[PDB]
Amino acid sequence: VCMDPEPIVRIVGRNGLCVDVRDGRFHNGNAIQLWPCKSNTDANQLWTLKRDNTIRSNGKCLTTYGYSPGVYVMIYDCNTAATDATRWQIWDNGTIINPRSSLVLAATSGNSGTTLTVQTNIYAVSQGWLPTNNTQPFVTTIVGLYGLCLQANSGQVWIEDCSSKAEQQWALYADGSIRPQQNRDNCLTSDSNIRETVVKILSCGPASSGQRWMFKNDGTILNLYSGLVLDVRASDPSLKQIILYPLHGDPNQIWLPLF
Amino acid sequence: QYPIINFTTAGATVQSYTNFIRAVRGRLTTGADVRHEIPVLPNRVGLPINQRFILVELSNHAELSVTLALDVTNAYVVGYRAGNSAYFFHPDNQEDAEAITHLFTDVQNRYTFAFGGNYDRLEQLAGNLRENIELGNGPLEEAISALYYYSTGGTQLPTLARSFIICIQMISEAARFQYIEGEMRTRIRYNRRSAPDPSVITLENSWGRLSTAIQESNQGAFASPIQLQRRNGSKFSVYDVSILIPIIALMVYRCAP
C-alpha cells in the first residue's frame, strides 16, 4: 500500500484567496476565513493534511460548527472537538467535504474576511478548493478543435486562430473558475444547465455552479454540476459559439491547456 | 501472438493519429486501476509473460514496415523487428533480458545492442539532444525507413539512435501524456516538423517521479513539489494532482491503493 504523507500546504479557493484562521488567533471556536494568500511562515494559512483525514493549523483542527447548511467553520482543539466535525475529504474535483454531514466547505462571499461555512454541495465556485503552495493561478492558452485557441472578446467566447493575444490567455483559479487574463473579475460562465446554452464571460460575483470547470483526463472541460462539457457548436468555429453539451468525445469537445 | 496496433504515416491525419494513440493505451493497461482519475499501467509483479508486451506496427509512404515492442509496465520501447531481423536495447537486468526472449520468436536473426534505450545514451549516440531532433509525420517516416534499412548496411548508428528518439517520443511518450500527444497532433495537423519544447522535455524526464508523487499523494496533495517547465524556459512547481489530470494519461505502477 502506498505511503500516506502529511504535507503542509495552503488551501486556495474562491477568487484565489487563502483559507485563513482569523487574526492568527487559535482560541477554540475562532472562525476560519478567506484572506489574501500570505508569503511567509505564518501558521494561520499553512495546513497539515493529516493521515486521519484531519486538516491542521498550528496543531489545531479545521472544524465545522455543526452538520446543518450555513453553519460556520472554526479552529478547534483536535482532541476536544467532536471527532466527526474534524474529518474532511479532499476530492480530486476541488471539493472539501465533511463526511458525517455530507456538507461541503464554502465561502458564500468573495470578499477578504468572509467567514467560511459548510453548505450543500452544488459544485459551485464558492466550494472549489486547491491544496497548494502556489498562490498565483496558472495562466495558460487553451487549445481545442482544429488547434484553434479559446478567445475572450468582452462577454463573448469563441475559438480562433492561435497567436501568442492576451485575449487568448486564461487564468485557471484554484476555485475552479476559468478567467480571462485581461479581467480577472470575470469568469467563463454558463448561465444555466440546459444543453446548447451558449457559454459567455460574466462577473465572478455569484461564484455559481455554472462558473466551475475541471479539465478531465479524457481532454474534455467539464462543468461539474450539470455534467455537460464545453463544445464548439456544430464543430464549426465560424459560428463563434461555445456551448454546454452532453459528452460524446468528438474533437469539438477536446481541449488542451498549453502552458 | 502479442496484441498489435498499426499506424501509417501515409495520409496520416489528426484523427488517425488519435485513434492510434488511443488504441495503444487501450492495450497498455485495462483502465481498471485509476488513481485520482489517472490510469495506472499493470503492476510488473503478477503480470504473466504472455501479457508483458504489445506490438506497434509502423509503415510509411514507401511501404516500409517496422514493428516496435513496448513493455506494458512502462509503455517504453524495448526493441523492434524489421523483416527477419530483430534488435533490442541492452536490458537493465537479467529478468528483462529473459522477458525479451519471448518477443519475435519466429525471427531468424536476433541482436542485443550494447547500449540501453535511455535518452541520455541515445542522444550521445545520435550526436544531438531531443531539443534539436525534430518531430512530426516526416521525421516518423524517415525514422521508419532508417530502422528498416539497419539490417541492410545502409543506416549508420547516429541515424538509428535518432530514429529511436523519434519513435519513442511520438509513440511511448504520447501514450504517457495527452499533452505530448497534443503536441504531436499539432505537428501532424499543419504538416510541420518541430523539435519538442522544454515543457515536453521536462514532462518526459519527470514521468517516473510524477507517477510516484501522484500515487503516494495525500488526497492529491504531493509530499514534495515537482518542478515542470512552461513552453518557454520558465519553471514552475506542482503541488497537487489537479493540474496533471489533463496532462498525464498513464502512470507506471508504484504501489497499491
Epitope: L145, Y146, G147, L148, E160, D161, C162, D231, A234, S235, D236, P237, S238, Y245, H248, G249, D250, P251, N252, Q253 | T13, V14, Q15, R189, Y190, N191
Partner: nanobody, 109 residues
C-alpha cells in the same frame, strides 16, 4: 469537394437533400446572409440544430458512403432559400482550419 442535389413543393410537404462528397474527417453542416441550419460532428454523435428549424429538420451522415443528408419535414414558406452544404477540417488556412462549401440547391415552398 461537395455537390448538392434533391432541391418545389407546397407548405407542409417533405424534401430530402443529399450532399455527395468526393473524398469522414470533416464535420458537416447545412446552411441556407448564409445562416446555420444544422450540423453534425465527424463521427456523428453530436447533432446541433438552429432554433428556427429545431424539431422539424433532421441532419444525418454516413461515412462509408461519404454522403450527408438533410431531412426537411413540415416545411413553411420561411424555409424557401438556397441550401448549401458545408464542411470543416483540420488543415492550414487564414481561418486556421479548412472550410469547403457546395454549389447550392434551390428550394421553394
Amino acid at each position: 469537394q461537395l455537390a448538392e442535389s434533391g432541391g418545389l413543393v407546397q407548405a407542409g410537404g417533405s424534401l430530402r437533400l443529399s450532399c455527395a462528397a468526393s473524398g469522414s474527417d470533416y464535420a458537416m453542416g447545412w446552411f441556407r446572409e448564409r445562416d446555420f441550419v444544422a450540423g453534425i460532428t465527424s463521427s456523428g454523435g453530436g447533432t446541433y440544430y438552429a432554433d428556427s428549424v429545431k424539431g422539424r429538420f433532421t441532419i444525418t451522415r454516413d461515412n462509408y458512403k461519404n454522403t450527408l443528408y438533410l431531412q426537411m419535414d413540415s416545411l413553411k414558406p420561411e424555409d424557401t432559400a438556397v441550401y448549401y452544404c458545408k464542411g470543416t477540417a483540420d488543415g492550414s488556412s487564414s481561418l486556421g482550419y479548412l472550410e469547403v462549401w457546395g454549389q447550392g440547391t434551390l428550394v421553394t415552398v
